[PDB]
Amino acid sequence: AVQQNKPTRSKRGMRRSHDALTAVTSLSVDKTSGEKHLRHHITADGYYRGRKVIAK
Amino acid sequence: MRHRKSGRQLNRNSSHRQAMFRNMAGSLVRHEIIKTTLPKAKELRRVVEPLITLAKTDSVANRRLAFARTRDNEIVAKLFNELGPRFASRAGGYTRILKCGFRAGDNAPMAYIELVDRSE
Amino acid sequence: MIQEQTMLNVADNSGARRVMCIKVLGGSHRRYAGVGDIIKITIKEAIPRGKVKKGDVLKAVVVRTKKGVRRPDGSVIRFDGNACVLLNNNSEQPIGTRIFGPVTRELRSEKFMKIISLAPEV
RNA sequence: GCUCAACGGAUAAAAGGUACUCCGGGGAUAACAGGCUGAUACCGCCCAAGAGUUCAUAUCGACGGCGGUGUUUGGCACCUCGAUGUCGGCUCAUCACAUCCUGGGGCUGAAGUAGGUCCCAAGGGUAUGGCUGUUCGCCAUUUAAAGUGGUACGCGAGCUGGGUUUAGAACGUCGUGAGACAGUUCGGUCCCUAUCUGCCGUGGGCGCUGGAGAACUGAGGGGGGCUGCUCCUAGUACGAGAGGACCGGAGUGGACGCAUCACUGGUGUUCGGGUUGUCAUGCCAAUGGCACUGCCCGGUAGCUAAAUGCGGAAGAGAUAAGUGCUGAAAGCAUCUAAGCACGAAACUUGCCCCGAGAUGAGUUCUCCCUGACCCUUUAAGGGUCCUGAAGGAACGUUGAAGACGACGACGUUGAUAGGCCGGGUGUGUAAGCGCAGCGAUGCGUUGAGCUAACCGGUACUAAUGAACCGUGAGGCUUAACCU
RNA sequence: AAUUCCUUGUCGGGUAAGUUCCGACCUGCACGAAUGGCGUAAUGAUGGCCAGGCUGUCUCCACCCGAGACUCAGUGAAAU
RNA sequence: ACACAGGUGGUCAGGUAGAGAAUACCAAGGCGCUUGAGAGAACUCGGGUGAAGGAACUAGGCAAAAUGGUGCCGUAACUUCGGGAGAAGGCACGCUGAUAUGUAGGUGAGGUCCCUCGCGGAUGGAGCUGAAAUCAGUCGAAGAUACCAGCUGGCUGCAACU
RNA sequence: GCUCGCCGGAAGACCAAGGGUUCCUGUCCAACGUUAAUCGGGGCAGGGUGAGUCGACCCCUAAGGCGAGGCCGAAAGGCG
RNA sequence: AGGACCGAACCGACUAAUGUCGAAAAAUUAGCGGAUGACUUGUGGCUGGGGGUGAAAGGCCAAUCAAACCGGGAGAUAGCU
């Protein structure tokens, strides 16, 4: 249930191919406050679609 | 394989699942807005909505029924007296879901669930 | 549904009380017996004067089934028990004459028409 | 001189047992499996007395010989003793044909029927139980048949541990005893998260050469291929009678496989009700929590079988055994050398699924793109700013889609999901109130109340624009068509 | 037979079928009288067999509820 | 070896039901076990339910399933006369009213009687201890309703038995 | 702080044993906790245990040990 | 009255699953046997390696038992690897 010969560092790297994270690239700037909030996510202060939504 | 199946387990047995919604609903009504995890928030939508629909009418039977579940005199008095008349006109949809951030410590997607009104 | 090692209540005056199936006939590795089939049985409980005796082999036709049958409209006829009618191992004719309880309509074969006439109901 | 007879004499004195075991080494040497061989066994061929009523060749076929296969019991000791780790069963198989069943034919001492024997033929199929640990085998009952073998006497990094080999114990027998066995009898630790190859599924990258969105072509590959019984023909052909077809048609089944919940049912800890114990709600009442959903009675949608439908095929092409035809060598004759026509579940298709990563990378339809420039080794080039389309991805509501990806619908010009409204279904007459009853309780209001995924509507709530990725006319050569 | 090789002895009961089981026979391969012999109520987490009851053990699995498995975030081994 | 599902002497130990220090739910008091969030595949582990058949599975009824309580009735072969035996196998169990100041049996005196002068003896036996059985009615499919709680019988080897 | 769940002849409250400041407060988060930590039995500093009646010690002996002389034994030493 | 029966505490460890680099260097869960006695248990003593103890297996003697552990002879010897 174990290895037979150790895998090469080359074969090690190929297994790490599909491990890079994906960047966001969807930072919608708010209409009024202009924060860098994600789409369909409220801002850091609680603004969404140009509205004090959180009341906080 | 849950074809056409509803509900969510939320990694809990039924009794605990049910009892935490009994607590979460009353926690909402007393505060009108709470922060919770997103999947929990979506499942709360199928619980409080029946109660506001239960408060759109009023009787003694409904008062006992909304006391049958939710088990609180304070909440049932918060219900049937203010939330009912406040939502007398709306045909369903008494909750809003706002996705806040990410709970650093378990990376959970948290969200804000509140009443539609919240007029101050 | 009748299969091997299935106890059957006797339904004629052949002289038995309890019989046990051993081998569903008609086809290799057939696993079930419906209302109009021949099965091979043994005798496990008999009256002292009957035509047969305890420990013989012969055939039967399972006339009543707790699973029942399905009529072409979808209706079912489920009895309370499992009943058989003994046969003659070569000529297939019933041994006893008087047959108790109801029988189904689907037993209506030329080779079971004798049984149809002797049954009281249905 | 006595003893070295194991006779170059371990000094002239020295018998056994062990699976509590241990250590050093060996595949230098055994047991399991492989390999080589093929005596023995298994199969086939040759000769043929003779039996067979006559008739050797219908069949055997003594006596003998010539080979084949590598499945029996053995021979050798080549691989392994710094481990190839187990007898059988179970689950799951694959291949061979020396074929058990089904199919196609030849001959008879085959009337028919039903069999006998031989040849061709591997596609599918090829029991359930009783005793034994068993393989095997005997028996019971079936079935169209319950084929012979190779695969480490297939399979134990897949399960089991009964057998068999551990330390306990007893019987009989042998031995003075320790213990032993052509012996049997109870009990007795079966470890491993998969790197690679392999296989079953599912995606990412780039390429397919201008890019993108779809519909197919089809190389090639895989699945599938079983059959019983009854009736019509007909009780006809045939027959001495008794019996009794072929061929062709149709219905109805067993096993198996694919597909689906309309019905029959299963489950349904998210739906309704009953009820025991107990705690809390200040008490009664009415509810709620816990005791495996506390214990249970029903039960929607899904999923599902025991349920309900469907399939095997026909036919076509070229063939095997075999049947021929017309026909020379060999005036004849001859199925054959020329040629020509039939002839199987076999073979290539037909039927269903996958399928252009089929780098030989296909085809058709459609949509989008027609910038100013510097630069250098004027290169299918890069760089600067300007434009960034068709479309795509991400994000979001999500799904009878799904492990994650992926895939399908929708994203407000919107019914995608929740909620809501009505209906349906399920559960069986809520709560409160009023009457009668000593009361438990019962009756009226009430086929009520409450209803999870289901069905039809409804924007009440949540799916915000836009951004990001993707470009700017598509190398060279030759040829044919037009200036 | 906890002992019997031959052997699944032979006969009878039980079973549709019984190498195990119970009774019997006697050729006791190789029983035998305190290395105790033959029976024996009760008792036994004892060996073997049969029957009723009861059931998913099985025909043949089907569905559902939880803990992992799978995905995301943090930490982070092992034999070889 | 660890912030380890293990082990560690003595005292205290309430309420309801219950025979009980069993068990179920709770009090006092103490805790939610020191990785979570979603998903709701195959397969594994801990469990719930099952149409029809019911040991046909298998080395073997292994495991599960089932039996399971109280009162009353009834109980074989065999036997060392103790047993076997709770053999086997049956019937009633909830709740509410009366029958009957809760009957039967029961301690026993203020009291009357009593002598050697007795937190006293005899008597009715009050007061009261007081089940259960029976009759009538009522509810549910099910009344020992949960947890808890024997599977039973027959033949035989061996050993007496704990 | 408000609800909810679990144990409850215990996962409760107290002593002996054995450990040895882990007890309380201020303060800090590198390392230790199987993750994060402004939290802690972790680092750092300060503080905390008061007895004629509790326990120990003390008086008395049990099993048993040691043992003036004594007896035995190469020595050591053994028995008493 | 009982080396009596049923059955918790306590003690023991028959069956099955899980585990097998485990939570654990023999445990957990579900059921089981004894449970007023040849019982069990706290504290403190006495018996020691070819000996102690043993309801007897050759079991246990500090996770070690055909003979403990520590140190020494000892760098034993090793026709074997």
Side-chain angles (χ1 to χ4, degrees):
Chain A
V2 196
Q3 56 188 308
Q4 188 65 304
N5 302 294
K6 63 177 297 182
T8 312
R9 68 178 68 64
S10 175
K11 196 69 63 183
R12 188 168 61 68
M14 293 186 269
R15 189 167 65 276
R16 311 167 176 294
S17 60
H18 316 300
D19 298 60
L21 310 176
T22 178
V24 53
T25 61
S26 60
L27 294 182
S28 55
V29 184
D30 192 56
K31 296 185 294 178
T32 57
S33 298
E35 310 303 301
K36 273 293 183 181
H37 61 70
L38 303 171
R39 300 188 59 61
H40 305 70
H41 282 60
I42 59 177
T43 65
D45 310 293
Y47 266 107
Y48 190 60
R49 307 185 70 174
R51 185 174 60 276
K52 188 68 168 56
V53 296
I54 187 176
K56 183 178 183 179
Chain B
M1 48 181 82
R2 66 171 297 298
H3 286 181
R4 286 297 175 179
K5 196 159 297 175
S6 68
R8 297 186 180 185
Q9 297 185 182
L10 300 182
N11 292 295
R12 299 182 179 69
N13 56 295
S14 57
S15 57
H16 176 184
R17 179 171 59 275
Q18 182 189 303
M20 70 84 96
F21 289 123
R22 179 174 301 178
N23 300 301
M24 184 177 271
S27 183
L28 177 60
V29 180
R30 190 183 308 171
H31 303 60
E32 303 179 304
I33 177 178
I34 51 178
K35 190 176 183 179
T36 177
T37 61
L38 181 61
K40 284 188 179 180
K42 295 188 179 304
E43 195 59 62
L44 188 58
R45 294 202 294 181
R46 301 185 64 179
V47 188
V48 295
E49 296 274 290
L51 297 176
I52 303 178
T53 302
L54 186 62
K56 293 182 64 188
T57 171
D58 179 58
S59 59
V60 184
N62 298 176
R63 285 187 172 299
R64 291 188 174 184
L65 186 61
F67 182 62
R69 61 206 61 161
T70 80
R71 298 292 295 178
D72 284 296
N73 304 299
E74 184 179 302
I75 302 299
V76 63
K78 183 64 183 300
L79 271 173
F80 288 125
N81 291 176
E82 296 76 5
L83 302 180
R86 227 171 65 176
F87 293 116
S89 297
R90 309 180 89 69
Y94 314 114
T95 60
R96 296 180 63 179
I97 301 298
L98 300 176
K99 314 176 185 61
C100 176
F102 281 114
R103 190 165 62 178
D106 65 311
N107 198 301
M110 292 190 92
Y112 279 115
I113 179 176
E114 61 182 2
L115 302 171
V116 180
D117 184 294
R118 295 188 62 274
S119 184
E120 294 297 300
Chain C
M1 293 188 270
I2 306 299
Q3 60 179 303
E4 314 80 64
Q5 292 293 295
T6 302
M7 197 57 80
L8 280 298
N9 290 305
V10 184
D12 47 47
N13 58 304
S14 293
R17 191 52 52 67
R18 254 186 173 182
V19 299
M20 183 171 82
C21 182
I22 56 181
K23 185 67 179 179
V24 182
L25 301 174
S28 156
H29 199 59
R30 175 174 183 171
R31 297 194 300 294
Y32 287 118
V35 72
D37 300 299
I38 307 301
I39 58 178
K40 185 66 183 180
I41 59 179
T42 178
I43 294 70
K44 304 286 292 183
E45 210 174 6
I47 60 172
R49 295 71 180 61
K51 314 295 178 58
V52 295
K53 72 180 187 64
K54 198 198 72 174
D56 297 302
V57 296
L58 52 74
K59 306 177 182 179
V61 187
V62 289
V63 293
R64 284 197 288 291
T65 303
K66 183 172 293 178
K67 189 67 177 181
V69 294
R70 286 175 48 63
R71 310 310 294 289
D73 59 298
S75 63
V76 300
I77 304 176
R78 300 177 293 182
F79 305 118
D80 286 295
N82 298 299
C84 60
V85 178
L86 290 64
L87 304 178
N88 197 57
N89 180 61
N90 67 300
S91 58
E92 311 306 304
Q93 301 299 303
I95 308 174
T97 52
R98 187 129 56 63
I99 303 175
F100 314 121
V103 296
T104 184
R105 187 67 62 183
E106 200 60 62
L107 194 63
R108 215 160 189 172
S109 72
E110 66 298 296
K111 66 174 178 178
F112 302 135
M113 200 64 81
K114 187 62 184 178
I115 304 175
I116 306 299
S117 61
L118 296 173
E121 310 190 313
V122 181

